[PDB]
PDB file of C-alpha atoms and ligand atoms in Angstrom:
ATOM      1  CA  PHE F   1     -16.507  44.664  33.009  1.00 57.62           C
ATOM      2  CA  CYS F   2     -19.783  43.031  34.155  1.00 56.86           C
ATOM      3  CA  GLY F   3     -18.389  39.952  35.733  1.00 55.07           C
ATOM      4  CA  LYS F   4     -15.746  37.261  34.653  1.00 55.60           C
ATOM      5  CA  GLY F   5     -17.029  35.570  31.385  1.00 53.25           C
ATOM      6  CA  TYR F   6     -19.097  35.762  28.920  1.00 50.95           C
ATOM      7  CA  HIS F   7     -21.999  38.262  30.323  1.00 52.86           C
ATOM      8  CA  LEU F   8     -25.410  37.435  30.061  1.00 56.35           C
ATOM      9  CA  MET F   9     -27.223  39.669  32.500  1.00 55.05           C
ATOM     10  CA  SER F  10     -27.288  41.712  35.787  1.00 54.23           C
ATOM     11  CA  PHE F  11     -29.662  41.959  38.790  1.00 53.99           C
ATOM     12  CA  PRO F  12     -28.977  45.092  41.210  1.00 53.84           C
ATOM     13  CA  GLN F  13     -29.587  44.876  44.808  1.00 52.84           C
ATOM     14  CA  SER F  14     -29.937  47.666  47.627  1.00 54.22           C
ATOM     15  CA  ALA F  15     -27.247  48.000  50.024  1.00 55.11           C
ATOM     16  CA  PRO F  16     -27.048  50.706  52.878  1.00 52.38           C
ATOM     17  CA  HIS F  17     -24.929  52.833  51.097  1.00 53.06           C
ATOM     18  CA  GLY F  18     -24.433  51.115  47.645  1.00 51.08           C
ATOM     19  CA  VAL F  19     -25.058  48.835  44.924  1.00 51.84           C
ATOM     20  CA  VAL F  20     -24.827  44.858  44.852  1.00 56.75           C
ATOM     21  CA  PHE F  21     -24.764  43.575  41.003  1.00 56.34           C
ATOM     22  CA  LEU F  22     -25.406  39.989  40.713  1.00 57.21           C
ATOM     23  CA  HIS F  23     -23.794  39.611  37.535  1.00 55.25           C
ATOM     24  CA  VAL F  24     -24.722  36.189  35.708  1.00 53.92           C
ATOM     25  CA  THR F  25     -21.990  34.907  33.341  1.00 57.55           C
ATOM     26  CA  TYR F  26     -21.526  32.233  30.813  1.00 55.19           C
ATOM     27  CA  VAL F  27     -18.143  30.006  31.491  1.00 54.42           C
ATOM     28  CA  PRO F  28     -17.280  26.993  29.132  1.00 56.32           C
ATOM     29  CA  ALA F  29     -16.270  23.712  30.474  1.00 59.10           C
ATOM     30  CA  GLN F  30     -14.993  20.223  29.039  1.00 60.14           C
ATOM     31  CA  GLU F  31     -12.814  21.002  26.444  1.00 59.76           C
ATOM     32  CA  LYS F  32     -11.640  18.232  23.746  1.00 58.84           C
ATOM     33  CA  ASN F  33      -8.406  18.233  21.531  1.00 60.99           C
ATOM     34  CA  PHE F  34      -9.321  18.473  17.508  1.00 60.00           C
ATOM     35  CA  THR F  35      -7.449  18.526  14.158  1.00 57.68           C
ATOM     36  CA  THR F  36      -7.899  21.279  12.259  1.00 56.36           C
ATOM     37  CA  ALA F  37      -6.909  23.117   9.191  1.00 55.05           C
ATOM     38  CA  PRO F  38      -7.700  26.693   7.653  1.00 58.51           C
ATOM     39  CA  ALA F  39      -9.690  25.795   4.244  1.00 61.19           C
ATOM     40  CA  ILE F  40     -10.847  22.552   2.501  1.00 59.62           C
ATOM     41  CA  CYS F  41      -9.786  22.258  -1.381  1.00 61.70           C
ATOM     42  CA  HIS F  42     -12.301  20.645  -3.566  1.00 61.39           C
ATOM     43  CA  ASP F  43     -12.813  20.830  -6.970  1.00 59.46           C
ATOM     44  CA  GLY F  44      -9.305  23.087  -7.182  1.00 60.36           C
ATOM     45  CA  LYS F  45     -10.920  25.745  -5.315  1.00 60.22           C
ATOM     46  CA  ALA F  46     -10.562  26.711  -1.384  1.00 62.09           C
ATOM     47  CA  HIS F  47     -13.631  26.880   0.499  1.00 64.37           C
ATOM     48  CA  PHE F  48     -13.860  28.568   3.959  1.00 64.61           C
ATOM     49  CA  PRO F  49     -16.621  28.623   6.791  1.00 65.99           C
ATOM     50  CA  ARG F  50     -18.980  31.231   7.033  1.00 65.72           C
ATOM     51  CA  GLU F  51     -19.262  30.889  10.654  1.00 66.24           C
ATOM     52  CA  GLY F  52     -17.303  28.071  13.000  1.00 65.88           C
ATOM     53  CA  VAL F  53     -14.253  25.992  12.017  1.00 66.23           C
ATOM     54  CA  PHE F  54     -13.201  23.029  10.154  1.00 63.94           C
ATOM     55  CA  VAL F  55     -13.008  20.299  12.847  1.00 64.14           C
ATOM     56  CA  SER F  56     -11.649  16.721  12.186  1.00 64.14           C
ATOM     57  CA  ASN F  57     -11.904  14.097  14.681  1.00 66.36           C
ATOM     58  CA  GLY F  58      -9.995  11.889  12.986  1.00 65.82           C
ATOM     59  CA  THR F  59     -11.001  10.740  10.011  1.00 60.98           C
ATOM     60  CA  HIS F  60     -14.367  12.970   8.694  1.00 60.04           C
ATOM     61  CA  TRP F  61     -14.112  16.554   8.789  1.00 59.67           C
ATOM     62  CA  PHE F  62     -17.068  18.849   9.971  1.00 59.87           C
ATOM     63  CA  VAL F  63     -17.895  22.427  10.595  1.00 58.22           C
ATOM     64  CA  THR F  64     -18.374  23.530  14.110  1.00 59.00           C
ATOM     65  CA  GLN F  65     -19.570  26.622  15.828  1.00 57.06           C
ATOM     66  CA  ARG F  66     -16.537  28.111  17.926  1.00 57.24           C
ATOM     67  CA  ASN F  67     -17.871  28.011  21.278  1.00 58.09           C
ATOM     68  CA  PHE F  68     -19.810  24.751  21.766  1.00 61.20           C
ATOM     69  CA  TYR F  69     -19.581  21.462  20.201  1.00 61.86           C
ATOM     70  CA  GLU F  70     -22.097  20.743  17.462  1.00 62.64           C
ATOM     71  CA  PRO F  71     -20.303  19.379  14.506  1.00 61.38           C
ATOM     72  CA  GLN F  72     -22.269  19.237  10.896  1.00 61.80           C
ATOM     73  CA  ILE F  73     -21.639  17.984   7.292  1.00 61.64           C
ATOM     74  CA  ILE F  74     -19.678  20.371   5.295  1.00 64.54           C
ATOM     75  CA  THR F  75     -22.188  21.450   2.659  1.00 67.83           C
ATOM     76  CA  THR F  76     -21.662  24.621   0.095  1.00 65.90           C
ATOM     77  CA  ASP F  77     -24.541  26.546   2.308  1.00 69.01           C
ATOM     78  CA  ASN F  78     -21.861  26.790   5.234  1.00 66.93           C
ATOM     79  CA  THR F  79     -18.828  27.492   3.460  1.00 67.28           C
ATOM     80  CA  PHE F  80     -17.673  30.093   0.666  1.00 67.50           C
ATOM     81  CA  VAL F  81     -15.398  29.939  -2.060  1.00 64.29           C
ATOM     82  CA  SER F  82     -12.232  32.255  -3.081  1.00 64.66           C
ATOM     83  CA  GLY F  83     -10.061  31.436  -5.799  1.00 64.10           C
ATOM     84  CA  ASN F  84      -7.923  28.250  -6.564  1.00 68.15           C
ATOM     85  CA  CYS F  85      -6.450  26.043  -3.819  1.00 68.79           C
ATOM     86  CA  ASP F  86      -2.606  26.549  -4.131  1.00 68.91           C
ATOM     87  CA  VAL F  87      -1.927  29.843  -2.588  1.00 68.32           C
ATOM     88  CA  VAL F  88      -3.467  28.949   0.841  1.00 69.28           C
ATOM     89  CA  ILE F  89      -1.181  27.107   3.589  1.00 71.32           C
ATOM     90  CA  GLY F  90      -2.572  23.921   5.285  1.00 77.42           C
ATOM     91  CA  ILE F  91      -5.168  23.428   2.721  1.00 76.67           C
ATOM     92  CA  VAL F  92      -6.747  19.929   2.837  1.00 77.14           C
ATOM     93  CA  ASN F  93      -9.087  17.663   0.289  1.00 76.12           C
ATOM     94  CA  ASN F  94     -12.549  17.005   1.156  1.00 75.43           C
ATOM     95  CA  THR F  95     -15.753  16.019  -0.752  1.00 75.88           C
ATOM     96  CA  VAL F  96     -18.033  19.326   0.015  1.00 76.34           C
ATOM     97  CA  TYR F  97     -21.578  18.284  -0.953  1.00 74.56           C
ATOM     98  CA  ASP F  98     -24.096  20.578  -2.634  1.00 77.17           C
ATOM     99  CA  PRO F  99     -27.598  19.866  -1.578  1.00 77.25           C
ATOM    100  CA  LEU F 100     -29.037  20.854  -5.196  1.00 75.15           C
ATOM    101  CA  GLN F 101     -27.440  17.542  -6.662  1.00 75.63           C
ATOM    102  CA  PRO F 102     -29.140  14.945  -4.464  1.00 76.87           C
ATOM    103  CA  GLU F 103     -32.459  16.489  -5.434  1.00 76.71           C
ATOM    104  CA  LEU F 104     -32.124  16.620  -8.907  1.00 80.24           C
ATOM    105  CA  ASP F 105     -34.963  18.695  -9.628  1.00 80.60           C
TER     106      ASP F 105
ATOM    107  CA  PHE U   1      18.386  60.860  57.863  1.00 81.13           C
ATOM    108  CA  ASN U   2      15.705  62.967  59.269  1.00 82.46           C
ATOM    109  CA  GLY U   3      12.914  60.531  59.693  1.00 81.81           C
ATOM    110  CA  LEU U   4      11.945  60.173  56.146  1.00 80.17           C
ATOM    111  CA  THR U   5      11.807  56.542  54.720  1.00 76.84           C
ATOM    112  CA  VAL U   6      10.918  54.936  51.361  1.00 75.37           C
ATOM    113  CA  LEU U   7       9.423  51.380  51.812  1.00 73.28           C
ATOM    114  CA  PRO U   8       9.982  48.977  49.241  1.00 72.16           C
ATOM    115  CA  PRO U   9       7.019  47.577  47.283  1.00 71.40           C
ATOM    116  CA  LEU U  10       5.690  44.185  47.235  1.00 69.68           C
ATOM    117  CA  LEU U  11       5.972  42.347  44.199  1.00 70.82           C
ATOM    118  CA  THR U  12       9.611  42.696  42.894  1.00 71.25           C
ATOM    119  CA  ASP U  13      10.845  43.867  39.543  1.00 77.60           C
ATOM    120  CA  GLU U  14      11.362  39.962  38.532  1.00 73.49           C
ATOM    121  CA  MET U  15       7.724  38.924  39.770  1.00 73.14           C
ATOM    122  CA  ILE U  16       6.060  41.866  37.691  1.00 74.67           C
ATOM    123  CA  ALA U  17       7.584  40.568  34.976  1.00 71.83           C
ATOM    124  CA  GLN U  18       6.958  36.501  34.939  1.00 69.40           C
ATOM    125  CA  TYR U  19       3.281  38.000  35.270  1.00 70.86           C
ATOM    126  CA  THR U  20       3.441  39.606  32.120  1.00 73.08           C
ATOM    127  CA  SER U  21       5.032  36.724  30.227  1.00 75.15           C
ATOM    128  CA  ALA U  22       2.289  34.737  31.606  1.00 75.51           C
ATOM    129  CA  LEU U  23      -0.386  37.152  29.589  1.00 73.30           C
ATOM    130  CA  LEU U  24       2.022  36.757  26.787  1.00 70.90           C
ATOM    131  CA  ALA U  25       2.241  33.141  26.760  1.00 73.47           C
ATOM    132  CA  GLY U  26      -1.364  33.276  27.105  1.00 72.33           C
ATOM    133  CA  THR U  27      -2.216  35.046  24.411  1.00 71.75           C
ATOM    134  CA  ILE U  28      -0.193  34.215  21.757  1.00 71.67           C
ATOM    135  CA  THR U  29      -1.246  30.337  22.129  1.00 69.54           C
ATOM    136  CA  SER U  30      -5.073  30.619  23.531  1.00 70.59           C
ATOM    137  CA  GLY U  31      -6.375  34.366  22.452  1.00 68.50           C
ATOM    138  CA  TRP U  32      -9.360  35.599  24.605  1.00 62.97           C
ATOM    139  CA  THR U  33     -10.161  32.349  25.778  1.00 60.74           C
ATOM    140  CA  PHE U  34      -7.891  32.110  28.230  1.00 61.71           C
ATOM    141  CA  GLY U  35      -9.544  35.149  30.399  1.00 65.47           C
ATOM    142  CA  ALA U  36     -13.102  33.718  30.060  1.00 66.65           C
ATOM    143  CA  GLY U  37     -12.137  30.451  31.696  1.00 66.96           C
ATOM    144  CA  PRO U  38      -9.790  27.784  30.397  1.00 67.15           C
ATOM    145  CA  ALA U  39      -7.534  28.547  27.902  1.00 64.88           C
ATOM    146  CA  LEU U  40      -8.132  26.446  24.592  1.00 67.67           C
ATOM    147  CA  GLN U  41      -5.034  26.374  22.065  1.00 65.28           C
ATOM    148  CA  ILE U  42      -5.581  27.434  18.583  1.00 66.89           C
ATOM    149  CA  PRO U  43      -3.179  28.226  15.747  1.00 67.44           C
ATOM    150  CA  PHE U  44      -1.652  31.436  15.528  1.00 69.64           C
ATOM    151  CA  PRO U  45      -2.947  32.356  12.042  1.00 68.52           C
ATOM    152  CA  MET U  46      -6.552  31.207  12.551  1.00 69.27           C
ATOM    153  CA  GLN U  47      -6.458  33.371  15.756  1.00 70.06           C
ATOM    154  CA  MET U  48      -5.418  36.462  13.543  1.00 71.62           C
ATOM    155  CA  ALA U  49      -8.007  35.403  10.795  1.00 69.04           C
ATOM    156  CA  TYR U  50     -10.283  35.513  13.870  1.00 70.09           C
ATOM    157  CA  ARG U  51      -9.434  38.783  14.536  1.00 71.79           C
ATOM    158  CA  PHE U  52      -9.678  40.177  10.977  1.00 71.01           C
ATOM    159  CA  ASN U  53     -12.952  38.621  10.844  1.00 72.52           C
ATOM    160  CA  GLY U  54     -13.520  40.640  13.917  1.00 74.29           C
ATOM    161  CA  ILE U  55     -13.107  43.910  12.049  1.00 76.31           C
ATOM    162  CA  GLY U  56     -15.227  43.392   9.180  1.00 76.40           C
ATOM    163  CA  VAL U  57     -12.553  41.664   6.834  1.00 75.70           C
ATOM    164  CA  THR U  58     -12.972  38.528   5.448  1.00 72.74           C
ATOM    165  CA  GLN U  59     -10.855  35.774   6.580  1.00 70.89           C
ATOM    166  CA  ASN U  60      -9.836  35.003   3.001  1.00 70.94           C
ATOM    167  CA  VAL U  61      -7.789  38.120   2.810  1.00 71.43           C
ATOM    168  CA  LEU U  62      -5.620  36.705   5.892  1.00 71.44           C
ATOM    169  CA  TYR U  63      -4.828  33.098   4.277  1.00 70.41           C
ATOM    170  CA  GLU U  64      -3.696  35.148   1.257  1.00 69.97           C
ATOM    171  CA  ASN U  65      -1.436  37.462   2.522  1.00 70.22           C
ATOM    172  CA  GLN U  66      -0.036  35.903   5.160  1.00 68.64           C
ATOM    173  CA  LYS U  67       3.610  36.259   4.082  1.00 70.31           C
ATOM    174  CA  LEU U  68       2.896  39.573   3.648  1.00 68.78           C
ATOM    175  CA  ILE U  69       1.251  40.448   6.834  1.00 69.14           C
ATOM    176  CA  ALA U  70       4.202  38.620   8.786  1.00 67.69           C
ATOM    177  CA  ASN U  71       6.469  40.609   7.170  1.00 69.97           C
ATOM    178  CA  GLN U  72       4.802  43.620   7.953  1.00 69.32           C
ATOM    179  CA  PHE U  73       4.517  42.982  11.378  1.00 70.76           C
ATOM    180  CA  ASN U  74       7.826  42.023  12.196  1.00 70.88           C
ATOM    181  CA  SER U  75       8.783  45.249  10.613  1.00 74.23           C
ATOM    182  CA  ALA U  76       6.517  47.203  12.387  1.00 71.04           C
ATOM    183  CA  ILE U  77       8.136  45.637  16.039  1.00 69.46           C
ATOM    184  CA  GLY U  78      11.748  46.070  14.919  1.00 71.25           C
ATOM    185  CA  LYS U  79      11.196  49.843  13.750  1.00 72.24           C
ATOM    186  CA  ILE U  80       9.734  50.224  17.916  1.00 68.78           C
ATOM    187  CA  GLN U  81      12.652  49.282  19.496  1.00 67.41           C
ATOM    188  CA  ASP U  82      14.711  51.748  17.144  1.00 71.06           C
ATOM    189  CA  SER U  83      12.078  54.601  18.020  1.00 68.98           C
ATOM    190  CA  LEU U  84      12.191  54.046  21.723  1.00 67.05           C
ATOM    191  CA  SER U  85      16.562  54.334  22.040  1.00 66.22           C
ATOM    192  CA  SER U  86      16.531  57.325  19.739  1.00 66.02           C
ATOM    193  CA  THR U  87      13.434  59.309  21.242  1.00 65.53           C
ATOM    194  CA  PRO U  88      14.887  61.125  24.370  1.00 65.54           C
TER     195      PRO U  88
HETATM  196  C1  NAG L 201      -7.457  19.094  26.700  1.00 63.63           C
HETATM  197  C2  NAG L 201      -6.937  18.251  26.637  1.00 63.63           C
HETATM  198  O1  NAG L 201      -6.732  16.844  27.289  1.00 63.63           O
HETATM  199  N1  NAG L 201      -5.666  18.597  26.108  1.00 63.63           N
HETATM  200  C3  NAG L 201      -4.667  17.571  25.831  1.00 63.63           C
HETATM  201  C4  NAG L 201      -3.299  17.412  27.034  1.00 63.63           C
HETATM  202  O2  NAG L 201      -4.261  16.607  28.118  1.00 63.63           O
HETATM  203  C5  NAG L 201      -2.456  16.497  26.611  1.00 63.63           C
HETATM  204  O3  NAG L 201      -1.371  16.209  27.702  1.00 63.63           O
HETATM  205  C6  NAG L 201      -1.898  16.767  25.517  1.00 63.63           C
HETATM  206  C7  NAG L 201      -0.321  15.913  25.088  1.00 63.63           C
HETATM  207  O4  NAG L 201      -0.907  14.758  24.970  1.00 63.63           O
HETATM  208  O5  NAG L 201      -2.645  17.183  24.448  1.00 63.63           O
HETATM  209  C8  NAG L 201      -3.507  18.014  24.478  1.00 63.63           C
HETATM  210  C1  NAG L 202     -12.481   8.219  15.051  1.00 62.13           C
HETATM  211  C2  NAG L 202     -14.177   8.725  15.231  1.00 62.13           C
HETATM  212  O1  NAG L 202     -14.510   9.349  15.901  1.00 62.13           O
HETATM  213  N1  NAG L 202     -14.905   8.221  13.788  1.00 62.13           N
HETATM  214  C3  NAG L 202     -16.073   8.761  13.960  1.00 62.13           C
HETATM  215  C4  NAG L 202     -17.116   7.689  12.903  1.00 62.13           C
HETATM  216  O2  NAG L 202     -16.848   6.441  13.952  1.00 62.13           O
HETATM  217  C5  NAG L 202     -18.187   8.142  13.102  1.00 62.13           C
HETATM  218  O3  NAG L 202     -18.780   7.153  12.070  1.00 62.13           O
HETATM  219  C6  NAG L 202     -18.295   9.088  11.975  1.00 62.13           C
HETATM  220  C7  NAG L 202     -19.931   9.571  11.557  1.00 62.13           C
HETATM  221  O4  NAG L 202     -20.526   9.984  12.797  1.00 62.13           O
HETATM  222  O5  NAG L 202     -18.007  10.168  12.847  1.00 62.13           O
HETATM  223  C8  NAG L 202     -16.167  10.045  12.457  1.00 62.13           C
HETATM  224  C1  NAG L 203      -2.280  18.564   0.523  1.00 62.24           C
HETATM  225  C2  NAG L 203      -3.022  17.723  -0.611  1.00 62.24           C
HETATM  226  O1  NAG L 203      -4.262  17.857  -0.220  1.00 62.24           O
HETATM  227  N1  NAG L 203      -2.662  17.447  -1.438  1.00 62.24           N
HETATM  228  C3  NAG L 203      -3.155  16.797  -2.582  1.00 62.24           C
HETATM  229  C4  NAG L 203      -2.190  16.029  -3.685  1.00 62.24           C
HETATM  230  O2  NAG L 203      -1.458  15.269  -2.851  1.00 62.24           O
HETATM  231  C5  NAG L 203      -2.986  15.618  -4.945  1.00 62.24           C
HETATM  232  O3  NAG L 203      -1.907  14.980  -5.805  1.00 62.24           O
HETATM  233  C6  NAG L 203      -3.857  16.414  -5.276  1.00 62.24           C
HETATM  234  C7  NAG L 203      -4.369  16.138  -6.659  1.00 62.24           C
HETATM  235  O4  NAG L 203      -6.156  16.509  -6.609  1.00 62.24           O
HETATM  236  O5  NAG L 203      -4.783  17.071  -4.727  1.00 62.24           O
HETATM  237  C8  NAG L 203      -3.906  17.652  -3.423  1.00 62.24           C
END
């Protein structure tokens, strides 16, 4: 509606009999391939991402926001659990660290 | 005649069907992204999980009912054609 791409803002400019809108849009570029899975199985329960996608770069699994590559280590803060891990199709296995354990308070 | 003529359209029916097929393939393999820039491929179940999340239902609901959901979608698409043919 307000230009091609994800809209940021727009500035109006007068014209003799109309308006001229200068839409400022954000457009992605420089994409890259990745391997993914819908859920991670750890301790027998399935984990899903709160926001983002489980993306693997060949040997390690990470979580990343959808529109810009920013991989993070999979932890209990950015994933949530639901039931045992045998109903989901495409589930994978990996260590899901819990930050309270290393502190050992 | 008496001076009245119908001119043909510029895009023939075949070419319009080709444009439509382009839109379908794009939406099936890349979701919304092909409309905002470079088309990025994404598995179709994950795309529908995105959209489920979009209406405020957590995605675990889709991965746990993938089979049932796929059957309902197939049945609905199947009844559409019968309805169009029987409807006068
Ligand atoms: C963005 C990107 O590089 N996508 C690649 C494409 O170049 C390659 O042709 C295809 C098959 O290898 O896999 C995918
Ligand atoms: C194939 C590949 O890229 N593997 C990398 C590895 O080299 C790196 O040490 C690790 C930690 O960032 O992430 C992954
Ligand atoms: C798809 C997958 O991850 N399968 C593994 C399976 O090979 C293994 O025997 C089991 C034991 O925890 O964990 C799961």
